[PDB]
Amino acid sequence: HHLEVLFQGPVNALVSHLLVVEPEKLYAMPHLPAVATLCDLFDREIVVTISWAKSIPGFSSLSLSDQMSVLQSVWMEVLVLGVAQRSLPLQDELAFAEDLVLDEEGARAAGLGELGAALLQLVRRLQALRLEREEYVLLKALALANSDSVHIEDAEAVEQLREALHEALLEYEAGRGGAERRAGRLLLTLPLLRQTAGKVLAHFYGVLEGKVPMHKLFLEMLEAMM
């Protein structure tokens, strides 16, 4: 079941679907040290990210190989966008989970180096647009489909998924110099989104040593689930 029928109708059925498959709020707390708590939380975010992707209409239409290639290239973007998303109502704070909210200094003390600052930069870029939840899920799905993995074997198939999600965003906006410009403004945050994800990976790999090899960790979980 590839859920392709959701691309046929008015977009509101697709949006309703994205809203439903949005992961449940996680609780990071039960007493572990900050680093350990975040590590445990991270493992759960990885699994949730993978299950989320598989429920994105049209994703399953891609060859198994391309699904994995797409996921390996943007999983951090999806994850990071979730963090930014939970942080929007706050000021200069990061809601890693319902019950785990850190300011810049708290992030630094939790082993995140300067990621606190980098993540808040992303958060501020999104807060400036005052996202609604519908825009976030559409943008997130689009970020998944806008992967630029070097290992994609059917590039037009990925192109078509990306196009369909972009058109969904447009149709959603149109139905709330085209003022539906609203869509472009969301798209213009995608470069910072990708950069932020790269920054997170660089921090855990060290600079490129491999202290905390998240790509391997992700792959192992990916192939265990797919």
Residues at the interface with ligand 5FB (CB under 6 A): 35, 38-39, 41-42, 45, 80, 83, 96, 110-112, 115, 200, 212
Q: How far apart, in whole angstroms, are the C-alpha atoms of residue 196 and residue 177?
A: 29
Main-chain dihedrals φ then ψ at residue 94, nearest 5 degrees: -120, 120
User: H/E element holding 135?
Assistant: helix 133-145
3-state secondary structure of 89: coil
- Alpha carbon 102 to chain centroid distance? 19
* Angle ∠(39,41,42) on CA atoms, nearest 5: 65
- Taking the least distance from each CB to ligand 5FB, the nearer of 18 and 110 is 110
Helix, strand, coil fractions of the chain, as percent rounded to 5: 65, 5, 30
- Taking the least distance from each CB to ligand 5FB, the nearer of 115 and 165 is 115
CB of 115 to ligand 5FB, least distance (A): 5
- Taking the least distance from each CB to ligand 5FB, the nearer of 38 and 141 is 38
- Taking the least distance from each CB to ligand 5FB, the nearer of 104 and 171 is 104
CB of 114 to ligand 5FB, least distance (A): 11
CB of 180 to ligand 5FB, least distance (A): 31
CB of 63 to ligand 5FB, least distance (A): 29
